[PDB]
Amino acid sequence: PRISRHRNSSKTYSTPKKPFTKPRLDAELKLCGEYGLKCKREIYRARYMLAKIRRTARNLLTLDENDIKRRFEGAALLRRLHMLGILDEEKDQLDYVLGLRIEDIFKRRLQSVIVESKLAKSVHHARNMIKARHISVGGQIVNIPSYMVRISNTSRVAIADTSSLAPNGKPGRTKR
Amino acid sequence: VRINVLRDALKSICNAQRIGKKQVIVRPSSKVIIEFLQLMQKNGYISDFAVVDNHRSNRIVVNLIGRLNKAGVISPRFDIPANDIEKWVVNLLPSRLFGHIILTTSQGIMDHIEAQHRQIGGKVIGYFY
Amino acid sequence: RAHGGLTSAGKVRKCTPKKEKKEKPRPPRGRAYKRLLYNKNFVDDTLIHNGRRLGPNNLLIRQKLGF
Amino acid sequence: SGKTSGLYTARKLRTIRRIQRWADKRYRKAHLGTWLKANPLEGACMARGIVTQKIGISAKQPNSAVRKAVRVQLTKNSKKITAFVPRDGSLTYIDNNDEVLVAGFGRAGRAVGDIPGCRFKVIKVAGIGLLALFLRKREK
Amino acid sequence: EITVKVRKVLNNPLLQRQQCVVDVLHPGCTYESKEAIKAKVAQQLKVADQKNIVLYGFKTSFGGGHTVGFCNAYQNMDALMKYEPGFRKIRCGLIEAPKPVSRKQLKNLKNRRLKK
RNA sequence: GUCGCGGCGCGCCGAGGGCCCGACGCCUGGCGGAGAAUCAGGGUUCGACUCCGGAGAGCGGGCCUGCGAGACGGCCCGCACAUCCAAGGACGGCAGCAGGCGCGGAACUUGCCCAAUGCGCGGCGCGCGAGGCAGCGACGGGGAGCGCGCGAGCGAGGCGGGCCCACAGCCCCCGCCGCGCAGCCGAGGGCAAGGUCUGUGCCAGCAGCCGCGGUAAUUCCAGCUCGGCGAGCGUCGCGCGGCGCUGCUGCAGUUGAAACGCCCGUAGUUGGCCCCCCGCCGCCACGAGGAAACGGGAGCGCUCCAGGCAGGCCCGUUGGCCC
């Protein structure tokens, strides 16, 4: 009754068992300053998924090389990480997946890919620009700063076709 | 009286190795002890074992090469799913690479590695590393 | 008359003087707050590091913030 | 002790656990059902109540103070609770026989701190939380 | 630009129609309405009768507009009148809308008529 | 007798049937499983509600109709507790949906429609408080904000559209107008953050715990600073982990809690070796068959996501496969 009940949801963010550790806390502030993260919840989502992917590689470790399940899952797990551009394309092995750190997940951010493209020359300005949707991924305007661009779309990401740089109309201060 | 004979003998073998004695006399002898000793001799943790046959239970004289850390019995002889034999090794044996859990299978008494090689579960006689 | 009890209800809360809040500007709530806390510690290393870091609330570190 | 370990001794192992699992005071409190029947807050986070009287309790030594408290009769079980009103001077906010919500001190039915005999403490008075009254966020 | 190429065309002999996916690649400002888009839709459909074409479901995507809609184009207007959900046909004026009761009013009258 | 087997009812004839491998009796703030929570492994805990199967429609009975109900939005009666009333009589049943009340710490609109999703009725469309849709809605889950720039620029909003929709709406897309907008616990430790000024003086208070306060409080009442989390933060109850402090893995008993004072003993449990070669065991592997959701997982850009099984110029497009 009410298929709204049938819709599901998941916990994507994991809090530290030890809440107050001064060395870990300060490092999280560095990550938050360097990658322009909003709150430590932001970091938790990335930390959780790094853990699960590495855990999947460890589950595959206890399987024999080329096991029907090991080969099928192994191909897919490696494929998604280099498909997103997170893991070294050439390695494609479980051991290389084990070394991945949340910095890779932070690098996939659309707001991160802008500071490398020199569009906003500031993670905090990239965040600001994405909020005004002045950056478009290949014909898709994005208001969300964690688009997680797949490797191919780095060429596509550019200033939006809507008024901004090379403007469609009047943007911002010229408009106002 | 003696309900487990393997355990009593293996404890003696470990006790002799502690005081650095090569030759041990095991007072009770059994086919399971015989097979357990044969597997250890193959893996070279023990040397030649000579059974002095008597008109009773039999005694075994075992020459030790000084290369066994520890042996043991699992009582009762549990039933192990072939899939979960790894869990038994992870806890009882140190390191996946070194150490032998000795099993019994309808095919025969066999090594945990051999049990994995044909994926057949069984009962654990004991363990040696 | 040391116990006081129900007759001493209130007491130090009622006796206390009221010192006013000093008017302050808002903080940059947002990732910006994380950005500015980072510029307080890891970037600059002057506000906390008098030669070496002294801790966020050290008395020497105060007054260098005008406090 | 051999801890009965035979392949056919699985009723003995089960029996021993069920009988000796009752020795633990915490498992006993949790699964005996004695707490549920005897709890003034029986399986409830909190309960409504009238203040029997406003009486301070002298604190256990070394600490020396009269911690103002209110005796409270519960609507649900008609049992009398001694509830410590918290913060400073908050007893004044309460009047005798006012509506009061009371929650446990946080030690799960055990007394917290120097207050003697205080399994619970006052959270709200006549619809207004005592902190809200204390901070003046919401007045009486 | 009204780039309505029209995809996933399916002729339905049963309903005497040819329903089809529709994509409008318009940059910047919104496409100017469903009915104006319909004139181009008929040309791409090649049905050649303006009345039997109608698009159910239009959504403009976030940022760039690549709206996907499903135009029902029929061989005959009378096939459209025999087989069209009344509410959509009410919106297009093909059929008029005899306004009903409150559904509750039908229930209240039903209860009294049952009482007879 | 029943649709039918049966102590299922009846006569008759015997003397059984159960049990320390716990019967019977009693109790249960006992629906059961699919599942859920927590988590190395093993465990533990919970099964109101989605799916399934049961069981009931205030409480007992008893019934006809029917293909099927011991039906309660059928009837009949006993028992409560009601309502209409002209006092003669009549007539009940929200463990349907809103809504009232009682109670409890605790829980939504007397809201709108059959158009899907089904079903009822018959080839030509209506019925459905099933269901959908909106309202309330910090149960909770997820995505963005409160800036940034030297002056760059929105979205939150507003106003008309487009479109959506049973109609509304909301989203999104357009043009214009453009109002960024934070808290809640703490700093003696555990446990992150003041060898600052006020008050107070074992008082008031604080403090899960150890502790602070007795006139110079790092612990209170304030100011100031600073910390942690974050549109959430605190508080209380409970489950799990912690806790190998329940111990199968895996606990202890000389002295911290704990070998019965001693011995025989029935059940129970445990039983040296020894026969290769089959027979039944147990045991282990391998099948077969038995719903999904769910957990995992392939494939996939909901603008990102929590999602969903979609999508795309297509495996016979997919939605495998495991549980």
| Total of domains in chain E | 1
- The DSSP 8-state label assigned to residue D59 in this structure reads P
Q: Which of A151, A152, A153 is nearest to A142 (CA)?
A: A153
Check whether the bond before D62 is cis (ω within 30° of 0).
yes
Are the Cβ atoms of C5 and D54 closer than 8 angstroms? no
| Phi, psi (deg, nearest 5) at residue D9 | -95, 65
Are the Cβ atoms of A161 and E62 closer than 8 angstroms? no
Residue A49: which domain range? 19-166
D50 has which bridge partners? D73, D99
Are the Cβ atoms of A141 and E62 closer than 8 angstroms? yes
At B9 the three-state DSSP class reads helix
**Chains C and D lie in contact, requiring 3 or more CB pairs less than 8 Å apart:** yes
Are the Cβ atoms of D66 and C5 closer than 8 angstroms? yes
- The reply to whether A84 falls in a domain is yes
Q: How far apart are CA D69 and CA D86, in angstroms?
A: 8
Cβ atoms of D105 and D118 closer than 8 Å? yes
Q: How far apart are CA C59 and CA C56, in angstroms?
A: 9
D71 touching C (Cβ < 8 Å): no
Q: Is the dihedral of CA B87, B91, B93, B96 positive or negative?
A: positive
Q: How far apart are CA B66 and CA B50, in angstroms?
A: 17
CA–CA distances in Å: residue D76 to residues A13, D36, D42, D43, D102: 40, 13, 9, 12, 12
Q: Does strand F come within 7 Å of the CB of C66?
A: no
Chain A residues 101-160 with Cβ under 7 Å of strand F are 120-122, 124-125, 127-128, 130-134, 137, 140-150, 153
CA–CA distances in Å: residue A71 to residues A51, A92, B117: 21, 12, 19
Q: How far apart are CA B100 and CA B95, in angstroms?
A: 10
Q: How far apart are CA A100 and CA A96, in angstroms?
A: 7
Long-range CB contacts for residues E55-61, cutoff 8 Å, separation at least 24 = E55/E22, E56/E85, E56/E88, E58/E34, E60/E30, E60/E31
At B92 the three-state DSSP class reads helix
Contacts of B66 (CB under 8 A, 6+ apart): B17, B20, B22
Q: How far apart are CA B92 and CA B46, in angstroms?
A: 20
Name residue, tokens 């403009």: E60
- The reply to whether E108 falls in a domain is no
CATH of residue E65's domain is 3.30.70.3370
Q: Which of A105, A126, A101 is nearest to A116 (CA)?
A: A126
> Neighbouring chains of A at 3+ CB pairs within 8 Å?
C, E
Please tell me the distance in Å from D28's CA to the nearest CA on chain C. 39
DSSP per residue over chain A, as a string?
--TTTT----------SS---HHHHHHHHHHHHHTT-SSHHHHHHHHHHHHHHHHHHHHHHTSPTT-HHHHHHHHHHHHHHHHHT-S-TTT-SHHHHHT--HHHHHHT-HHHHHHHHTSSSSHHHHHHHHHTT-EEETTEE---S-----TTHHHHEEE-SSSSSS-SS--TTTT-
Q: How far apart are CA A95 and CA B128, in angstroms?
A: 31
Breaks (C-N over 2.5 A) in chain A follow: none
Task: Find the CB nearest E63 among A141, A168, A169.
Answer: A141
Cβ atoms of D48 and D99 closer than 8 Å? yes
Name residue, tokens 């917290």: D112
- The reply to whether E88 falls in a domain is yes
- The reply to whether E103 falls in a domain is no
- Nearest amino-acid residue to F129, taking CA and C1': E104
Q: Encoding tokens for residue A37?
A: 């993260």
Q: Which of E8, E47, E4, E45 is nearest to E24 (CA)?
A: E4
State CA E47 to chain mean position distance.
Answer: 15
Could you tell me the resolution of this structure in angstroms? 3.2
Cβ atoms of A31 and A102 closer than 8 Å? yes
Cβ atoms of D103 and D93 closer than 8 Å? no
Q: Encoding tokens for residue A96?
A: 């290389």
B108 Ramachandran zone, left/alpha/beta (phi>0; psi -120 to 50):
left
D64 Ramachandran zone, left/alpha/beta (phi>0; psi -120 to 50):
beta
Q: Which of B66, B29, B22 is nearest to B45 (CA)?
A: B66
Pairing of strands D120-125, D80-84: parallel
Q: Which residues of A20-38 are buried (b: 16+ CB within 10 A; e: fewer)?
A: eeeeeeeebbebbbbbbbb
Q: Encoding tokens for residue E91?
A: 């919106």
- The reply to whether A2 falls in a domain is no
Q: How far apart are CA D113 and CA D108, in angstroms?
A: 13
Beta-carbon-side half-sphere exposure of residue A91 (alpha carbons within 13 Å)? 16
- The DSSP 8-state label assigned to residue C14 in this structure reads H
Name residue, tokens 């459209």: E80
Q: Encoding tokens for residue A98?
A: 């084990």
Within 8 A of A161 by CB-CB distance, chain E residues are 27-28, 64
- The reply to whether A6 falls in a domain is no
Contacts of B126 (CB under 8 A, 6+ apart): B6, B7, B10, B36, B71, B72, B73, B74, B102
D58 touching C (Cβ < 8 Å): yes
Q: Does strand F come within 7 Å of the CB of D90?
A: yes
Q: How was this structure determined?
A: cryo-EM
Q: How far apart are CA E63 and CA A157, in angstroms?
A: 14
- The DSSP 8-state label assigned to residue E74 in this structure reads B
Residue E42: which domain range? 3-92
Within 8 A of A166 by CB-CB distance, chain E residues are none
| Total of domains in chain A | 1
CA–CA distances in Å: residue D85 to residues D53, D60, D130: 12, 17, 8
Q: Encoding tokens for residue E113?
A: 């008529």
Cα torsion D4, D9, D10, D16 to 10°: value is -40
Q: How far apart are CA B103 and CA B106, in angstroms?
A: 10
Greatest Cα-to-Cα distance within chain D, rounded to the nearest angstrom:
70
Contacts of B69 (CB under 8 A, 6+ apart): B129
- The reply to whether A14 falls in a domain is no
DSSP per residue over B44-77, as a string?
TSEEEEEEE--SSS-EEEEEE-S----EEE-SS-
- The reply to whether A59 falls in a domain is yes
> Which nucleotide minimizes the distance between its C1' and the CA of E32?
F162
Helix, strand, coil content of chain C in percent (nearest 5): 25, 5, 65
Within 8 A of C3 by CB-CB distance, chain D residues are 58, 66
Are the Cβ atoms of D89 and C5 closer than 8 angstroms? no
- The reply to whether A154 falls in a domain is yes
Where is D74: in which H helix or E strand? Answer: strand D66-74
Q: Which residues of B79-92 are buried (b: 16+ CB within 10 A; e: fewer)?
A: ebeeeebeebbeeb
- The DSSP 8-state label assigned to residue B79 in this structure reads E
- The reply to whether A173 falls in a domain is no
C46 touching A (Cβ < 8 Å): no
> Other C-beta atoms within 10 Å of B29: how many?
21
CA–CA distances in Å: residue B3 to residues B7, B44, D6, D7, D134: 9, 28, 12, 14, 74
Provide, in whole angstroms, the distance separating residue C61's CA from nucleotide F196's C1': 11
Q: Which amino acid is at A70?
A: R
> Other C-beta atoms within 10 Å of B50: how many?
10
Chain D residues 43-82 with Cβ under 7 Å of strand F are 43-48, 56, 59, 62-68, 74-76
State CA E21 to chain mean position distance.
Answer: 12
> Which nucleotide minimizes the distance between its C1' and the CA of A156?
F301
Cβ atoms of E28 and A161 closer than 8 Å? yes
